[PDB]
Structure formats: C-alpha cells, structure tokens
C-alpha cells in the first residue's frame, strides 16, 4: 500500500509568513476586486443625483438646479467634486457641513409653502432678481427664498410668526444680504442700520449686515449669508426685521428620516439595482472584503487596502 | 508504563478557530459580567448624586436643587439622562460641555460668597424672581447669581472688580438677560441699550442683549445666557455693565483637583464600597476583562464588547 495526499493542476498561489508564493490545491479569495462602474438603485430606491448641483444649491433652490423642485424619496444623495451651480449669488450658508450631516440621516423631504408671497403686502417680492443667478439667460434668484425690496420708497418692519402644526420637523432656511455700500443699502431697503431677529424655543439669533468692499465673484460684491434651523412640532419661529431680509418661502418637511449619505462622485448612473454601493461603482458580491474605496453605503463588505487576501483552503 | 493523561468531571468548554464548544478539563474565566446594580462609594468617598438636578442647575444653584449648598468631597458625579431641573428660567450656559469637561477633573468645590448683596446699594437684589423658578410654590431665582433690577427708575453703571486673593482657582459664573421688547427692558432696565463688558488677564467679552420675540418656554420668553470663567490666583475679573446683568454672588474654590467623571445614569444608590464603578453597577472583581459597560471609573478591568472569554488552561 502507500499513504499520501491529494494533488491537482491548480495554479492557485498563497501568501504565507515564511513563503510568499505557495502553489495550493484550492484557495478561497475573500476580496472582491471589481465593481459595476455605474451608480445603481440601493434596494429599489433611486438616489438623488444632484448633477452639476450642490446641497446648498438644491436646498436654497438655485435657478439652474430647477430639475429638483419635486424630489421623490432617495436612498443616498450624489454630488460632484466641484459643482458649478452652488450659491449662484455670492455668499455662504452658515453651518453648511452640519446641515449636510443632518441631511445624511434624512431620506425624504416634502417641500411645503410656509410663507406665500401674498404675505408681503408692503414690500416688493418680484424685483428680487440678480444676474449672478440667471434663468434661461435672464436674471433670476433662489426659488425657495424671497429677496424683499423696498416698496413706495419704504421698508416697514417685517414681523411674521410661523407655528409648526405638522407632526414632522421643518427645515427652514433664510438669509441676510450684505450690501455693497450705504447708497446701495438705501437704494434697496431705505434703512441704514438694519437687523434680522429670529427667535425659537432654542434659537435666539440677531444678524446685522456687513456693509463693506469685497471682490467680484460671479460679478457681484454683495454676500448673502444664508442660515437654517430645524423647527419641532408645536414650535413656532418668529422672524422680525427691517432690512436685508432674505425671507423664507418654501420649507422642507422632514417626512422620512432613516439612513443615507452624501456620496461624492461624478460616476454616471446606470439603470440598475444593487444592495451595496460605492462612489466608484456598485458591488454585487458576497465576499467578506472589498478593496474599491473606503466610503460605501448599504450592507457592504468591509474595506481593506490589500490587493491579495486569499485563504488557503488546501494543501501544498 | 501506560503513558496517558487524566480527565475530570467538569462539563465546561472553550472554543478555538477550527472548533467550538470543546469540552475541557480545567479552564480560567477572564470576564466578570456581573455587577451590584447599585451606585457605591469609590474608595471611601461617596459620589455627588444630582437627583432631579443637573450640573448647570447645581452650579447655578437652582431653587429646586437645595441639597447641594455644602457638598462634601466626591469621586464621581451621577446625573440622570434628562434631568428635570436645569436652567429653570429659559436660556443657555455658554461652553456648558467644556465646563463639564473641567468638572470631570475636579473632586471638590467650596463655594465662597464673593460679592455680598450689600455690594448693590443702587440696585434691587430681592425682586429678581420669576414663576419659572418656583420655591415652595412662591417664585424664586438661582441662588448663586443675583438678577439685578432698577431701584428708583434708574440702573446706575455697575463697575466691580474681584481680585482672586485665594490660593486656588475660582469658577466665577455670571450671565446676560435677553428681554422680550423695549417695554419689558424699560420696565426692568431703564437704559434702552445696554451691555456687559467682562475683562480678565485672559478673557475679553462684550455682550449685547438680543431683544427679540421667542417661543414661550416654561411660561417665559426671555433668555438668560449664562457664562463661566476660571480665575487664577493673583488674577482679577472686571465686570462693567449698565443693564441685563445677572451678577455673581457665589464663586467656587477648586479646593481638590483629581480624577473624576460625570456618570450620566439614574441607578439607585446603595450603601456600598468598590474599587471600580460603571453607570449601571459596581464591579468588585479581579478579572482581566469585563463587559458591563464601556464607561468606567477606578481600578477596573478592561472593557470588551463580548459575552464569552475563557482561556483553555486544561489539557483537552
């Protein structure tokens, strides 16, 4: 007789601590090294692909980002590395990164008209247009906020209180316009010393403009610093102002708050469903690991930077 | 010669990478996974249990938190997740989380009356009460700060400097009151536009009230934003203010400085002693690991998020 062991023609090679290329009978690769290369629908719900648009541009209602006036439920938001259409008028949304962090937990917005334009009898609502935010070439302005301007050479003190009667949180956005100079300030608002006093159960904000000289980004030297808040059910926001007020018109109702992320990628969209997704491309696999990109979403394999994670399920 | 090995009657078992539930001869457990379920003394000194009280409510002296006027030395602070009494009049405490971070290193405060009520000849000291901070039904206010009000249709300028003659740091607490409208201020503080300037060797503040309309919390629409500082030996704090001043009365000598934590739990306290403590219960044990809770204080085992560790000290 004789005693021994099995052999075959397998060219499978394995790393070991004292030998880095060991021809084994069988081996189980535990690393997925391939992706579909195109964005897919995570569990049937298609993402919100802000094509050439940002979170700020979408939320404030950029005129060029008008494809997102109505947005169905999304599994994850997708944004490019450097969106072109983002705060068309110069400015900066305060706590932008915190707003994105909160948005990463939100799966649906139901935009509602909280302050109709008919709620401004003594101010102009149709002249708040700039060339920095054009629509179809002609001048325009953000769609979800109203730039209020003097009427009859006057700007009466705005005082409006909105009470949340819904059972859901409301993300309310406003802003303050920082004018070019004093003569521009009286040309737009007829008030040298203006303010915006916002009040809530938690928020106690006062905003004074900053009339100064700045640079020409997007052809304008005024800066609209936008602000946001989240208003709880049975909680009331109180706006008071006498100038520089970029008032709310539309506010997003947080109607479904689950899990999501703001994925950064310019990868194209394929009409395809998935279960794990990555910025480079979806992963349709069930191996323990993958080595495509650190950030993923969904029930995914774990990320390891190695190129060859193989486990010896054989001899030799 | 009959070479072999023994075998006991124990049914205990261990696990390995290729087999699990391997029956063994003798084995050593290294996970304690039991606790008394009661807050205990830590090396002889009882903790500070803030029952229905908060760190802000304790330090500011909430009228509903009266058992902490002469707190002795402790080792850790225990607080409920949502204390009932905290900032009874609505408002905020700036850098509250930093103050709690510093209290995590402080084992004893001795409150000293730094500014007696006789040091306010030209202002009211026994009228700054509210219904948001009741005591025995009648209205009251924080006892470690004094709300100052006009005496005879006048609020003279308040310029007081406190020099830290003590050999220990002093945690000095003050605040700014945010009124509702100009009428309310003129009722309370005769001066329409007011401020609070605060100066130290390493601090500079210029606080202005935010007279705005806000939601009614605890029946009150004003907001007391409290502020804190640590004053070193031979260092003096300079308070200037013509209104809206929630002045200091008691500061806090940091007599003993060591290791501590804020436990954030509401387990009932039993008269017991231990070397290690967790929020849910104490740990009297010499095991290398534990799994009761991540946050611990004292000479403790090392947390491991598991339920079964055992070393196969036996033959089989």
């Amino acid at each position, epitope marked *: 007789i004789c005693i021994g062991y099995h052999a075959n023609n397998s060219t499978e090679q394995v790393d070991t601590i004292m030998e880095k290329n060991v021809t084994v009978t069988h081996a189980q690769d535990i690393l997925e090294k391939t992706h579909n290369g195109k964005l897919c629908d995570l569990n049937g719900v298609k993402p919100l692909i802000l094509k050439d648009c940002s979170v700020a541009g979408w939320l404030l209602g950029n005129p060029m980002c008008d494809e997102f006036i109505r947005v169905p439920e999304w599994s994850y938001i997708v944004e490019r590395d450097n969106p072109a259409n983002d705060l068309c008028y110069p400015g900066s949304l305060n706590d932008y990164e915190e707003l994105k962090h909160l948005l990463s937990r939100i799966n649906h917005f139901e935009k509602i008209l909280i302050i109709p334009k008919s709620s401004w009898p003594n101010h102009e609502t149709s002249l708040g247009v700039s060339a920095a935010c054009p629509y179809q070439g002609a001048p325009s302005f953000f769609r979800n906020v109203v730039w209020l301007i003097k009427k*009859d050479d006057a700007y009466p003190t705005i005082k409006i*209180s909105y009470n949340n009667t819904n059972r859901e949180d409301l993300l309310i956005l406003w802003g303050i316009h920082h004018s070019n100079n004093a003569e521009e300030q009286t040309n737009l608002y007829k008030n040298p010393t203006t303010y915006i006093s916002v009040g809530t159960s938690t928020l106690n904000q006062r905003l004074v403009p900053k009339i100064a000289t700045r640079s020409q980004v997007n052809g304008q030297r005024g800066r609209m610093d936008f602000f946001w808040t989240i208003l709880k059910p049975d909680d009331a926001i109180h706006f008071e102002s006498n100038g520089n007020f970029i008032a709310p018109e539309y506010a997003y109702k947080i109607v479904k708050k689950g899990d999501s992320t703001i994925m950064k990628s310019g990868v194209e969209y394929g009409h395809c469903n998935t279960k794990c997704q990555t910025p480079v491309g979806a992963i349709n696999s069930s191996m323990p690991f993958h080595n495509i990109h650190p950030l993923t979403i969904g029930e995914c394999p774990k990320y390891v930077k190695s190129n060859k994670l193989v486990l010896a399920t054989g001899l030799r | 010669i009959c070479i072999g090995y023994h075998a006991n009657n124990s049914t205990e078992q261990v696990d390995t990478i290729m087999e699990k539930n391997v029956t063994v001869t003798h084995a050593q457990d290294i996970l304690e996974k039991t606790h008394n379920g009661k807050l205990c003394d830590l090396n002889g000194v009882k903790p500070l249990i803030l029952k229905d009280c908060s760190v802000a409510g304790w330090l500011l002296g909430n009228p509903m938190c009266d058992e902490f006027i002469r707190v002795p030395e402790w080792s850790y602070i225990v607080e409920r997740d949502n204390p009932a009494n905290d900032l009874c009049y609505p408002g905020s405490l700036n850098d509250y989380e930093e103050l709690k971070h510093l209290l995590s290193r402080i084992n004893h405060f001795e409150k000293i009356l730094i500014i007696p009520k006789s040091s306010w000849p030209n202002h009211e000291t026994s009228l700054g009460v509210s219904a948001a901070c009741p005591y025995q039904g009648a209205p009251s206010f924080f006892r470690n700060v004094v709300w100052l009000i006009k005496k005879d249709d006048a609020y003279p300028t308040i310029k007081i400097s406190y020099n830290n003659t003590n050999r220990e740091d002093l945690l000095i607490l003050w605040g700014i009151h945010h009124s*509702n409208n100009a009428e309310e201020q003129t009722n309370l503080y005769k001066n329409p536009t007011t401020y609070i300037s605060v100066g130290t060797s390493t601090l500079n503040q210029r606080l202005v009230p935010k007279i705005a309309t806000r939601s009614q919390v605890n029946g009150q629409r004003g907001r007391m934003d409290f502020f804190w500082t640590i004053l070193k030996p031979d260092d003096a704090i300079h308070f200037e203010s013509n209104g809206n001043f929630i002045a200091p009365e008691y500061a806090y000598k940091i007599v003993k400085k060591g290791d501590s934590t804020i436990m954030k739990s509401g387990v009932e306290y039993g008269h017991c002693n231990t070397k290690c403590q967790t929020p849910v219960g104490a740990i009297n044990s010499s095991m290398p690991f534990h799994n009761i809770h991540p946050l611990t204080i004292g000479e403790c085992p090392k947390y491991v998020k598991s339920n079964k560790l055992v070393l196969a000290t036996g033959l089989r």
Partner: antibody
Amino acid sequence: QVQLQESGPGLVKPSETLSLTCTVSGDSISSYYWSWIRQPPGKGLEWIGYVHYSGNTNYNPSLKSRVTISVDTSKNQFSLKLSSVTAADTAVYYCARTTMSRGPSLYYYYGLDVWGQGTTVT
Amino acid sequence: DIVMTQSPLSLPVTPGEPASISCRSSQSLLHSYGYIYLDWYLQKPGQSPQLLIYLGSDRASGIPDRFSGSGAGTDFTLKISRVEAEDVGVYYCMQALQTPITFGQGTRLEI
C-alpha cells in the same frame, strides 16, 4: 395698489333683506380675511363680519342672528346679507381688507390697511 | 377686548403743540406671540377711515412721521407731535386680539 368699491341700494324696507357687494380690483381675493364695517351717522365704527378667503366666517355676537357673509373668488367679490332690516340698521357701510391671515400656522398682522369708499343705506 | 374706552371725546389743541390721545381696554391686548394687536385709525371728514398705526407702535405705509403709538397691556396712547392742519378728523382705537373686534369711541381733535 388694491382698490375696494361698494355696490348696493340706499333705500331699504324695514322688513326685508339687505344685500351689499364689495368688489376688489388690482388683486384677487386670495390670502386675507375680508371684513365688512358699518358706521351710523357720527357715533363710532362697528364691524358686521369677516370672511376668510377659504370661506370661514366670524360674525359679531350682537348681529350674529341676522348676518350672512359670502365670498366669490372667481368674480373677486364678497357680499353682506343683513336680514330683517331694522331702523337701527341705517348707516354708512365700509369695506376693508383685514390683511391678518392668522391661520393655524402662519401669523402676521397689518390692520385694516385698505378701505373701500363707503355706501349709505337707510 | 370687548370694551375699548377712549378717554378724550374731543381733544382741543392748537397747531404746533403735542397731542396725546389715550385708549384703555378692559382686557390685556397681548397676542400669544408678544404682539400688542392695537390699531390706530384716522377718519377725515370726507374720506373713509385710514390706518395710521398697527400692532401697538408700527407706522403704516403712506402716513407722516408725526404719528406714533405707545403703551403695552391695557394702557395705550397715540401721539401727534406736529398736529398740522389736515389732522382734523375722528381717531379710533381698534383691538384685533379676539374675534369680537371692537373700535373705541371717537375723539374729534378739534383744530
């Protein structure tokens, strides 16, 4: 530039129903509560009712039994229907825009800013 | 609320002199969101009533700067600093806190 104008007769019998109509031009009946007003010769202003643009109506408790207010957004008009005209109901009837819109959620207030030219009734 | 008592019934004052109309209430005129909810109106001899001031002291759109309100709670006062001609007319105080809106009694403000 919203302008309100009254319409209706002057002479009224002391037993039958009165009918006035107030027409608004420059903007539709869109977003505000619209209130009818009456002032006798001298004396002081008093208000009969006000109708929300939706249709919700609140009437004076003194005049609650006989009043009925309506609205017609298509025609940009709203009417008053005082029934059982007593000799007390001889006055000059004005027409104002309350401009409050104090609904369940949105609150603001601008007063009876725009007033129509009143119409006499006897 | 239901009763608005306007203290002068006819205020005599010459040109170039401050005037002070007053209007008490039988209830605290304070909305739940800290708004006074008083309105001062002027009725000229020919023209319909005109809004002068709303929400305590907030001037209306096309009104001169001489008019200014004051007061909180129940005691309220209109002030006419310049009292120039064409101010002749009956002044009213209205409460909009509750559904029974109530105007005050007139004050003629004789020139």
